Amino acid sequence: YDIQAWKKQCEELLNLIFQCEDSEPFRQPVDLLEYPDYRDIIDTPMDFATVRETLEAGNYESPMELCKDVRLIFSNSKAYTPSKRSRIYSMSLRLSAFFEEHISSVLSDYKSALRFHKR
């Protein structure tokens, strides 16, 4: 029923993601000194600190918008990798599976709560 519950649920999920060793490459914006051609490949950089900051600033209206940004972190990694076997891309796939498994109920509860609100 709670149309606002998704926000704390997303904060707690982001805390789990930061505790996860697989999030290490994605915790802060990609360093262009480390990867000089990154912006030649990636149009819209995204990282978990930016997601957390957007959420804490009150700049997400729904968990769907947060999901879109988290999914962009993973699609950027898939686009930048030269190999399906790279260490960082492999970490992104595990972290994506963990994220999708935990965000499913957040989106479901939010959409259900909003449908109840607008009934």
Ligand X SMILES: O=C(NC1CC1)c1cnn2cccnc12
Residues at the site binding ligand X, with contacts judged by CB under 6 A: 25-26, 30, 77, 80-81, 86, 88-89
- CA–centroid distance for 60 within its chain: 12
Rounded Cα gap, residues 62 and 55, in angstroms:
10
Minimal distance in Å, beta carbon 80 to ligand X?
4
Main-chain phi, psi angles of 23, to 5 degrees = -85, -10
Main-chain phi, psi angles of 108, to 5 degrees = -60, -50
Query: In terms of CB distance, is 9 or 76 closer to ligand X?
Result: 76
Minimal distance in Å, beta carbon 78 to ligand X?
8
Query: In terms of CB distance, is 31 or 101 closer to ligand X?
Result: 31
Rounded Cα gap, residues 72 and 118, in angstroms:
30
Minimal distance in Å, beta carbon 98 to ligand X?
17
Query: In terms of CB distance, is 66 or 72 closer to ligand X?
Result: 72
